[PDB]
């Protein structure tokens, strides 16, 4: 049970959206597209802030680095690129891995970026040390699909991998603090942390149609969420509301109750397959946004 007042703030059509992110202080959303283009939209005025044809290959990963006025993007041409969103200047452009970049995460306070790749690794880059490769984390046995810092202790982070595991690592240490054998036999496409201090929870999504919730202190599976009808692209905890939001190649978003783990609402926004998700980092208007085959939508909840 839950009162959900879902309003469509802004939707636009585009080529397939593979990455999406909210700016914390401007009413902007970044989308990164399978066509190699990236777009920054003001979702309040419904005007494009800036767009860039970055490459000819898919750009699967993109984040704002608001404290530097940057976007950082990673693509199937193996490269990390950074642009200043006020000028359009390309700040850096380097080959980060010898294979596709699937995911980029930004540390909340330090000048660190993580990239996960089909090269089986996560790499740590330091933009205050000339974008040095500070560490490579080895141990996964298939494509690393998702990386995320623990917001409550960002000296640690999680990687989710098609080898059916999540590994949680400490910066400066070469082996995982622990590996979760998820039992998601078709791999892990996504891993996320519950953001508030009261629960030490993580969440994983899989091509096996399931979402699983994990306690990272006991390393136990708390719940398995079933209901999606095709590959689950992502599942996240909302930063302010007691819900989980997932999206799937079945074309739906699902909102699940984070206490009972039962589905509360299924949304078919009409843009075909869902690939990516963002939640507004301050909880502004409880905003979420998702990217799909045929465009993106920004929704306000409750």
């Amino acid at each position: 049970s839950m009162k959900l007042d879902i309003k469509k703030t802004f939707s636009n059509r585009s080529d397939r959206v593979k990455g999406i992110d909210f700016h914390p202080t401007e009413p902007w959303v970044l989308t990164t597209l399978y066509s190699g283009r990236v777009e920054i939209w003001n979702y309040e005025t419904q005007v494009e802030v800036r767009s860039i044809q970055v490459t000819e290959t898919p750009v699967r990963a993109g984040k704002f680095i608001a404290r530097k006025n940057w976007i950082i993007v990673g693509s199937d041409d193996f490269r990390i690129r950074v642009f200043n969103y006020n000028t359009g200047e390309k700040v850096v452009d380097f080959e980060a891995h010898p294979d596709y970049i699937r995911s980029i995460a930004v540390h909340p306070t330090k000048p660190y970026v993580l990239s996960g790749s089909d090269d089986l690794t996560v790499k740590l880059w330091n933009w205050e040390n000339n974008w040095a490769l500070e560490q490579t984390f080895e141990g996964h046995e298939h494509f690393v699909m998702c990386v995320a810092f623990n917001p409550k202790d960002p000296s640690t982070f999680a990687s989710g991998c098609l080898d059916r595991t999540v590994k949680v690592w400490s910066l400066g240490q070469s082996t995982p603090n622990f590996t979760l054998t998820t039992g998601q036999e078709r791999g892990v496409n996504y891993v996320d942390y519950y953001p508030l201090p009261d629960k030490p929870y993580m969440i994983t999504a899989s091509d096996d149609l399931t979402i699983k919730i994990w306690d990272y202190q006991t390393k136990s599976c708390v719940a398995t969420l079933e209901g999606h009808m095709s590959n689950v692209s992502f599942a996240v905890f909302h930063p302010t509301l007691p819900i989980i939001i997932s999206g799937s190649e079945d074309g739906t978003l699902k909102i699940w109750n984070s206490s009972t783990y039962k589905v509360e609402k299924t949304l078919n926004v009409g843009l075909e397959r869902s690939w990516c998700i963002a939640t507004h980092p301050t909880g502004r208007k409880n905003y979420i946004a998702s990217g799909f085959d045929n465009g993106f939508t920004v929704l306000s909840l409750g």
Binding site: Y100, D118, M145, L162, N189
Partner: peptide, 7 residues
């Protein structure tokens, strides 16, 4: 070669 999760 074949690339999983190509889309």
């Amino acid at each position: 070669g074949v690339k999983l999760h190509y889309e």
